[PDB]
Every structure is written in structure tokens, then in C-alpha cells.
Symmetry: C2
Subunit: 110 residues, 2 copies
């Protein structure tokens, strides 16, 4: 019965979950590649003889460090968000299911 | 070079993305089933002759409506969260990549 808008709202939730799932998959693929490339660069850089590092290298190292700090803070914001993304939802849906079963039983519906 | 903790932090981000991806997949499967079951129940309930609805049906309908309102508010909280889950991240990583390329070029590394 068209008692409420429960179904569309759950539809909306399912829709955004599909979208989120697909977006995270893209993020994962992109990040895995970026991480692998950056890690490979750092490995080769790590092989440069210390004697060949000069004032420009020091400037670049410090800029890379500063950048890593800012990237961390941004990543932390993502990490915290993911920490939000439930017990109350499950309880409400369970009660709702129980009530629908009562209604069906009352009217001889399996 | 072990200049920074950029790599582990990106590793941590990738790890939580994997976990989030797998969790959303489970949510999607569970919700699709729940939605389908509830929608099927509502269809059969919607076929009950109006003449057979009494005081107990009215009580149950109102409780289902109230429940749908609370479920909506909870779902909205999820929807808003997903709305958070980035331009700044991409700019920082691009600059970081550029600096690593400068370092490699400086030292005759491809």
C-alpha cells in the first residue's frame, strides 16, 4: 500500500551506493597506479650517490617533505569521512518487516 | 629516498578504499534483497480489499508510516556522508610527481 515513501527513499540509498561503489573502484585503480609509480621513482632516487646531492636537491627534498605533510592532512580528511560511512537502520528495517508480516498474516497472505 | 612518510600514508588510504569498496558491495547486495522483499510484501498488502481493513490495520499503517519517516532521516544521514566521500589531492600529487621527475632528470635517471 502507498502508505509511505519508504521504497523510493531506499531506492535512492541503493542508487548512491551503486555510484559510490563504482567511484571507489576507480579511485582504487588510479591510486594503485600512482602509488606504484611514485614508489618506483623514490627507489631510483634512493640510489643516487649522496656525494651527488647538492643545494638544489636539498631544496627539492624539503619541498617534497612539505608536500607530503599537506597530502597527509588531506588524506586524513578522507580517512575520517570513510569512518562515518548502522545499528539504528537495521533495527528500524527489522521492525518494519515484522509489521508487514503481521499485516499479511492478518489478511491470509503468505 | 626516505625523505617522508608519503608512501605509507597513501598505502593507508588505498587500504581503507579497498575495505570501503568491499563493504559497500555487501551493503548493495543486502539492500537490494531487503528492498525487493519489502516491495513484494507491499504489493500483496496493496491487494487486500479495503473492506477488510479495520482498526488494527489503521494502527499498523500509521506505525509503518512513522517508521518510514525515521528511516528516511537515517538514510539522509548516509546520503549526506556519501556526499563528502578531490581537487586539492590531485594538485598536490601532480606537483609531487613533477618534483620527483626533476630530481630524476638532475641525476641522469629515466
Amino acid at each position: 500500500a502507498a502508505i509511505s515513501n519508504l521504497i523510493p527513499k531506499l531506492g535512492e540509498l541503493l542508487t548512491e551506493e551503486f555510484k559510490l561503489h563504482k567511484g571507489v573502484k576507480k579511485n582504487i585503480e588510479d591510486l594503485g597506479k600512482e602509488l606504484e609509480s611514485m614508489n618506483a621513482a623514490l627507489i631510483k632516487i634512493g640510489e643516487v650517490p649522496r656525494e651527488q646531492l647538492d643545494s638544489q636537491d636539498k631544496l627539492w627534498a624539503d619541498e617534497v617533505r612539505e608536500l607530503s605533510y599537506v597530502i597527509e592532512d588531506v588524506v586524513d580528511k578522507f580517512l575520517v569521512q570513510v569512518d562515518g560511512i548502522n545499528n539504528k537502520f537495521k533495527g528500524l528495517m527489522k521492525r518494519t518487516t515484522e509489521l508487514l508480516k503481521k499485516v499479511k498474516h492478518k489478511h491470509g497472505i503468505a
